[PDB]
Every structure is written in structure tokens, then in C-alpha cells.
Amino acid sequence: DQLEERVSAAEDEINEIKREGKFREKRIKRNEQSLQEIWDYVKRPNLRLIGVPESDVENGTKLENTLQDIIQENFPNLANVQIQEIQRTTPRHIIVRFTKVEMKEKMLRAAREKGRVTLKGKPIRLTVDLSAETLQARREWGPIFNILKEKNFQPRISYPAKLSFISEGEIKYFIDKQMLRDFVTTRPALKELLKEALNM
Amino acid sequence: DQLEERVSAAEDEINEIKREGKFREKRIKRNEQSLQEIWDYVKRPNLRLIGVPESDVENGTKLENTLQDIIQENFPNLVQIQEIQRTTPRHIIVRFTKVEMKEKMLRAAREKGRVTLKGKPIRLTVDLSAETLQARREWGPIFNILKEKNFQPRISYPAKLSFISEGEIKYFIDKQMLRDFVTTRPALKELLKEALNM
Amino acid sequence: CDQLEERVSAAEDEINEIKREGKFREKRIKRNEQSLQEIWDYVKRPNLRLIGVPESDVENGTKLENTLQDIIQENFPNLARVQIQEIQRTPRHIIVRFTKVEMKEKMLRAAREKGRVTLKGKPIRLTVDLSAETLQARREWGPIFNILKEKNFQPRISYPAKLSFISEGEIKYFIDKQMLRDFVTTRPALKELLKEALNM
Ligand SMILES: [Cl-]
Ligand SMILES: [Cl-]
């Protein structure tokens, strides 16, 4: 009597909690992605200089002078470029926040066209500044990216974390691994090649 | 047997959990309000262009040319850009170097009443966060009823509601805060009971 | 109704999940709160708050930019002997966005070393622009801060809201009250002193 009814009520409560728990999960998840996007957006005027030798008492002024050198040696075409701030975070990466986004895009463009950006002979690496999340997503493609590279698919990663490669004289784009699992399911060649990596 | 114990402990857990959740609920909404604001703050210099025909292979420079076209065609008297990018043609987002610049564009667009591009009507709006715009729209119905009964309402930033109750202006961040308010004022409650979904 | 022992056993299991999922989602929530704290602070780096400035009926960027100059002319002459991206209201506060962070840093040190800042004689203030999370994070390190300070523990506040004091002849850092709890759980003297504050 009194006991049986107590049980049923509890079961309804537990389920209700499970439901409210779902709608909560969704909202949290939406905030996570919302943070990811805004982080990226805010880091748009930002460039990452990689492989730049560390220095003693490396203040803002020295950094700026360094960026100048990099520009004079690689693409002096530019220019004094407006720098809102520059700082350090294997040498520590250097983050550069340009006053105008246009300035960054132009420098990246200059780098990717040049190919080998160097500093006094030593190769360095200029790259976009991404959020932890986005940056992590890109790393997860890693394993697959290499296999594709190996088999001459000419893979490429672009914003946010899109994978792209050649399949049938056409370039294919994939936002996530799931979308890719669907693609290969109808192409035995790729399916066999990417069975383990995709965890299918 | 003596299940009374186990089933009682379960109920206790159940209660605990319902309180646990309510707390997390609070913190989540807090973060949601913080995102709304941070987005609003960031996109403050941004402006939204709707109804602009897509162009085959259109670089960012052509986008800027399209911007200047609209300025000449609608605002003769009237420009620094950090960026202008795309998102039925996609919305175009124009980010000005100064927030002031955006404000003058909207005023001119509102004083002109109608904005065109090559003879075709387009639209100029802000770039407020999705969470904000929706929020503002949700106060709509209630705002209409309050205006009707001469409460002199007002919707400000972010999406605060403010009207006159007892010769004293009151502010409401969300609908819930309003529900608790009317709980001690029968007449008002009776007025907004259908709108508050109570 | 003897099979009731069946249903109850499961309900106990369901509750265990709800608890796990509950704590796990909670961890994500905090990671989000912490993330917002981080990005809000970052975005505001080039900012300074002007507090106590008499507002007018109708203002604008230019009229405000002049007022900003009067403050410099009146308080820090050798400082202007100043690149401003934009300035505007949120008497409301006035958010001053500099072109270069280094600039903001400089003037802040000028306002802090002058101690007393005035506009036409009227006392005003220039302060760092910090997130609401960080502020309240510091505010949470309030009572606990006063207890250590009063008992001569040399407590300090390291940005963002890191609490640090000297015990056992060493210097410890603490991000959240939780970590501090883990610490005093083994220091009877300290524990007894910080039990009321940590709600322990
Ligand atoms: Cl929950
Ligand atoms: Cl959250």
C-alpha cells in the first residue's frame, strides 16, 4: 500500500530528473561551443610566431624589434606596423595582436606564399591563433591526416577544424569525424584505408 | 521486509538532487547572461547587412566596394573598416574601427527609412548576440499590455524591462524575476497572468 | 507486490548515475565560469575605467576625448609630452580603450603613483578594467584574507585572484577555496583558524 505508491512516485521523479538533466546538458554544451567561437573570433587579429629563440629580459620593445627583423628578412614589403601588444606564452610561442585584422591576414598571406619563413637562417612558423577547443579538434584529425597524406590524398585543415582532401578529382570537406564515417561507407578504397582510425 | 529504509533514503536522495540541480541551473543561466554580454560587447562595432546579392568569386575588397556603393547611393553626405565578411543571400557583417561609426550608419538608415542597393531594398541592423535579440523579442507581448494600461514600460540593455509601479521605476532582468514580483501584487498579477505563462 | 525489491534496487542505481552525471556536469560548469573569467579579462586588457566624471546632457567620442586630455594635461604632463582607439560610457563609468596595451599600462602607473587624480579639482579615478568573475573571485578571498593578515601570515593577491601566504617558512598559492581546504586539512593550527571561513 503506502510503500508501493512511494516507489512509483520516486520512479516518476527520477525520470523527470533525467529529463531536466538532459535539457541542462544541452545548455551547458551550447555554452561550450559559444565560448569556442568567441575565443576564436577574439583571437582573429592574433598571430603565433613559432621557433623564435628566447632572450634575456625579453620585454615588449625587444619583441617589436624582433618582429621588425622578421619582416625585413622575409617580406619587407610591409611598412612600422601597428602592434596592440606582443608577448610570450622548446621556446614559448609569441602572440602578436595587430591593431588591424587586415594586417595579420596580409602577413599570413605573405608567409604561405613564401613557404619558408626564416629568422637569420633558422626556419620559423607563422600561424593563426585558435581557442583551446578548436586547436584540440585540429589535433584529433592528426592520425587520419597522416594516413591521407601518406596515400597521396593531399589533406588540409582549415577553420574551424575542417578536413579537406581529393577523392574524385573533387575536393571534399568534413567538419567532423562522423560526417567522414558516412562518406567512406560508400567507398571501399577509403573505408579499408581508414577503418581503424575512424574507429568504425 | 523493511524497504521503508531504502525507499526513504531514495526520497532523500531525490530531494538532495532536485536542490543540487536548481543550484547548477542558477550558475548555468549566470554563464548564459555572461556570454550574451561578452558577445554584445564584442560585436558592438559590428553591423549587419541583409539582402545583398551574392557575387561569383567575391573577395573582401569587393565586399568593401559594395559597402561604399551603399554609402554613395543612400548617404551622399557620408569610413574605416577592420573587416567585412559573409556569414537567400548570406548576411554581411561590417566591423567598423569605431563604434561611433556604426551608430551614424543606423541613424542615417533610420532617418532615410529605406535603404537600397542598385535599386533593390536591403536592410541595416545591429549585430547583437542571438541570445539578446531573442530575449528582447520575448518581452514583446508583456510590453504591449503594460503600455496599454499606462505603465510606461521600457526595454534597455541588455534586455531589462522597466515600468512604473507605485511612483517608482522597477527593473526586471528576466521573466522569472517578474513572476516573483507580481506574487505580492494581485491586480498586476491578474493583468499579466496570461502573458507570464503562470 | 513482493517483486518491489526488484524495482527499488534499480532506482538506487539510477540515482548513482544521476549523481555522477551531476558532478561531471558541475565540473564542466566551473570550467565554463573560469573560461568566461579568462576571456573577459583578456578582452579588457587595453581598457581603463574613468570613475567620477560629471556627465552631460549629450556627449560623444570627441567631447569625451577632450575631457580625457584635460585629465592628462592636469595630472600627467610629462606623460603626454596618447593613442586612443575609442572612448565612451557603459555618473556612469567611462571605458577608455587604448591602441597599445603598453600605453594603458603606462598611464595606470601614472595614476597610481600620483595617487590622487583630479578633473578641474574634482576627485576622480582611473582603474583597471576587470571581469565581474575576477572581481568577485577576489571578493571571495576577503574574510579568509583578513584572518591570515591579522594573524600575521603575509597574505597577498596575485592576479587574477590567486591567494598566497607564507606558512612553514614557505610560499603557497591557492586558486580556489577547495585547494586551501586540502591544505589546512593537515595543519591543525591553521585549520582551527580557517575553519569558520571555509565553511568547513
Ligand atoms: Cl543536472
Ligand atoms: Cl555553463
Coordinates of N, CA, C and O in Angstrom, one line a residue, chain A residues 3 6-7 9-11 13-14 17 20 24 27-28 30-32 34-35 37-39 41-42 44-45 99-102 105, chain B residues 3-4 7-8 11 14 17-18 21-22 24-25 28-29 31-32 35 38-39 42-43 46 80 82-83 85 93 95 130-131:
Chain A
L3 N 3.8 1.7 0.7 CA 5.1 1.5 0.1 C 5.1 1.5 -1.4 O 5.9 2.2 -2.0
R6 N 4.8 4.9 -2.9 CA 6.0 5.6 -2.7 C 7.1 5.3 -3.8 O 7.8 6.2 -4.2
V7 N 7.1 4.1 -4.2 CA 8.0 3.6 -5.2 C 7.7 4.3 -6.6 O 8.6 4.9 -7.2
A9 N 6.0 7.0 -7.4 CA 6.3 8.4 -7.4 C 7.8 8.7 -7.6 O 8.1 9.6 -8.3
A10 N 8.6 7.9 -6.9 CA 10.0 8.0 -7.0 C 10.5 7.8 -8.4 O 11.3 8.6 -8.9
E11 N 10.0 6.8 -9.0 CA 10.4 6.5 -10.4 C 10.0 7.6 -11.4 O 10.8 7.9 -12.3
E13 N 9.7 10.7 -10.5 CA 10.6 11.8 -10.1 C 12.0 11.6 -10.7 O 12.5 12.5 -11.4
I14 N 12.5 10.4 -10.6 CA 13.8 10.1 -11.2 C 13.9 10.3 -12.7 O 14.8 10.9 -13.2
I17 N 13.9 14.0 -13.3 CA 15.2 14.5 -13.1 C 16.1 14.1 -14.3 O 16.9 15.0 -14.7
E20 N 15.1 16.8 -17.1 CA 15.7 18.1 -16.7 C 17.2 18.0 -16.9 O 17.8 19.0 -17.2
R24 N 19.6 20.3 -19.4 CA 20.7 21.1 -18.8 C 22.0 20.8 -19.5 O 22.8 21.7 -19.8
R27 N 22.2 22.9 -22.7 CA 22.5 24.3 -22.4 C 24.0 24.5 -22.1 O 24.6 25.5 -22.5
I28 N 24.6 23.6 -21.3 CA 26.0 23.6 -21.0 C 26.8 23.5 -22.3 O 27.7 24.3 -22.5
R30 N 25.9 24.1 -25.3 CA 25.8 25.3 -26.1 C 26.7 26.4 -25.7 O 27.2 27.2 -26.5
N31 N 26.9 26.5 -24.4 CA 27.8 27.5 -23.8 C 29.3 27.2 -24.2 O 30.1 28.1 -24.4
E32 N 29.6 25.9 -24.2 CA 30.9 25.4 -24.5 C 31.3 25.9 -25.9 O 32.4 26.4 -26.1
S34 N 29.7 28.2 -27.7 CA 29.7 29.6 -27.7 C 31.0 30.2 -27.3 O 31.4 31.3 -27.8
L35 N 31.6 29.6 -26.3 CA 32.9 30.1 -25.8 C 34.0 29.8 -26.9 O 34.9 30.7 -27.1
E37 N 33.7 29.6 -30.2 CA 33.6 30.6 -31.3 C 34.1 31.9 -30.9 O 34.9 32.5 -31.7
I38 N 33.6 32.5 -29.8 CA 34.0 33.8 -29.4 C 35.5 33.9 -29.1 O 36.1 34.9 -29.4
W39 N 36.1 32.8 -28.6 CA 37.5 32.8 -28.3 C 38.3 32.9 -29.6 O 39.2 33.7 -29.7
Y41 N 37.0 34.2 -32.5 CA 36.7 35.5 -33.0 C 37.6 36.6 -32.4 O 38.1 37.4 -33.1
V42 N 37.8 36.5 -31.1 CA 38.6 37.5 -30.4 C 40.1 37.3 -30.7 O 40.9 38.3 -30.7
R44 N 41.2 36.6 -33.7 CA 41.3 36.9 -35.1 C 42.5 37.8 -35.5 O 43.2 37.5 -36.4
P45 N 42.7 38.9 -34.7 CA 43.8 39.8 -35.0 C 45.1 39.2 -34.5 O 46.1 39.9 -34.4
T99 N 46.8 45.9 -34.6 CA 45.8 46.9 -34.5 C 44.6 46.6 -35.5 O 43.5 46.8 -35.1
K100 N 45.0 46.2 -36.7 CA 44.0 45.9 -37.7 C 44.1 44.5 -38.2 O 45.2 44.0 -38.6
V101 N 43.0 43.8 -38.2 CA 43.0 42.4 -38.6 C 43.6 42.2 -40.0 O 44.3 41.3 -40.3
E102 N 43.3 43.2 -40.9 CA 43.8 43.2 -42.2 C 45.3 43.0 -42.2 O 45.9 42.2 -43.1
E105 N 46.2 39.1 -41.7 CA 45.8 38.4 -42.9 C 46.9 38.6 -44.0 O 47.2 37.7 -44.7
Chain B
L3 N 11.7 -2.3 3.6 CA 12.1 -1.5 2.5 C 12.0 0.0 2.8 O 12.6 0.9 2.3
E4 N 11.1 0.3 3.8 CA 10.8 1.6 4.3 C 12.1 2.5 4.4 O 12.2 3.6 4.0
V7 N 13.7 3.0 0.5 CA 12.8 3.9 -0.2 C 12.8 5.3 0.4 O 12.5 6.2 -0.3
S8 N 13.0 5.4 1.7 CA 13.1 6.7 2.4 C 14.4 7.4 2.0 O 14.4 8.6 1.8
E11 N 14.1 8.8 -1.5 CA 13.4 10.1 -1.5 C 14.3 11.2 -1.0 O 14.3 12.3 -1.6
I14 N 16.5 11.9 -3.8 CA 15.7 12.6 -4.8 C 15.7 14.1 -4.4 O 15.9 15.0 -5.3
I17 N 19.1 15.8 -4.8 CA 19.3 16.0 -6.3 C 18.5 17.2 -6.9 O 19.1 18.0 -7.6
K18 N 17.3 17.3 -6.5 CA 16.4 18.4 -7.0 C 17.0 19.8 -6.6 O 16.8 20.8 -7.3
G21 N 20.4 20.3 -8.6 CA 20.1 20.8 -9.9 C 19.8 22.2 -10.0 O 20.3 23.0 -10.8
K22 N 18.9 22.7 -9.1 CA 18.4 24.1 -9.1 C 19.6 25.0 -9.0 O 19.6 26.1 -9.6
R24 N 22.9 24.3 -9.9 CA 23.6 24.3 -11.2 C 22.8 25.1 -12.2 O 23.4 25.8 -13.1
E25 N 21.5 25.0 -12.2 CA 20.6 25.8 -13.1 C 21.0 27.2 -13.0 O 21.2 27.9 -14.0
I28 N 24.4 28.1 -14.5 CA 24.4 28.0 -16.0 C 23.8 29.2 -16.6 O 24.3 29.8 -17.5
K29 N 22.6 29.7 -16.1 CA 22.0 30.9 -16.5 C 22.9 32.1 -16.4 O 22.9 33.0 -17.2
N31 N 26.2 32.1 -16.5 CA 27.1 32.0 -17.6 C 26.5 32.4 -18.9 O 27.1 33.0 -19.8
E32 N 25.2 32.0 -19.1 CA 24.5 32.4 -20.3 C 24.3 33.9 -20.4 O 24.3 34.4 -21.5
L35 N 27.8 35.3 -21.4 CA 28.1 35.1 -22.9 C 27.3 36.2 -23.7 O 27.9 36.9 -24.5
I38 N 29.2 39.4 -23.2 CA 30.5 39.5 -23.9 C 30.4 39.5 -25.4 O 31.1 40.2 -26.0
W39 N 29.4 38.8 -25.9 CA 29.1 38.9 -27.3 C 28.7 40.2 -27.7 O 29.2 40.8 -28.7
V42 N 31.6 42.6 -27.7 CA 32.5 42.4 -28.8 C 31.9 42.9 -30.2 O 32.6 43.7 -30.9
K43 N 30.7 42.5 -30.5 CA 30.1 42.8 -31.7 C 29.5 44.2 -31.7 O 28.7 44.6 -32.6
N46 N 30.2 46.1 -34.8 CA 29.7 45.3 -35.9 C 28.4 45.8 -36.4 O 27.5 46.2 -35.6
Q80 N 36.4 53.8 -41.8 CA 37.5 52.8 -41.5 C 36.9 51.4 -41.2 O 35.9 51.3 -40.5
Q82 N 37.8 47.4 -40.1 CA 38.8 46.4 -39.6 C 38.6 45.1 -40.4 O 39.5 44.3 -40.6
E83 N 37.3 44.9 -40.8 CA 37.0 43.6 -41.5 C 35.5 43.7 -42.0 O 34.7 44.3 -41.4
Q85 N 32.9 40.6 -43.8 CA 32.8 39.2 -44.2 C 31.4 38.7 -44.3 O 30.5 39.3 -43.7
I93 N 28.6 41.0 -42.5 CA 29.0 41.7 -41.3 C 30.1 42.7 -41.5 O 31.2 42.3 -42.0
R95 N 32.5 45.3 -39.8 CA 33.1 45.8 -38.5 C 33.8 47.1 -38.7 O 34.9 47.1 -39.3
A130 N 22.7 36.6 -30.6 CA 21.5 35.9 -30.8 C 20.6 35.8 -29.5 O 19.4 35.9 -29.6
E131 N 21.3 35.5 -28.4 CA 20.6 35.4 -27.1 C 19.9 36.7 -26.7 O 18.9 36.6 -26.1

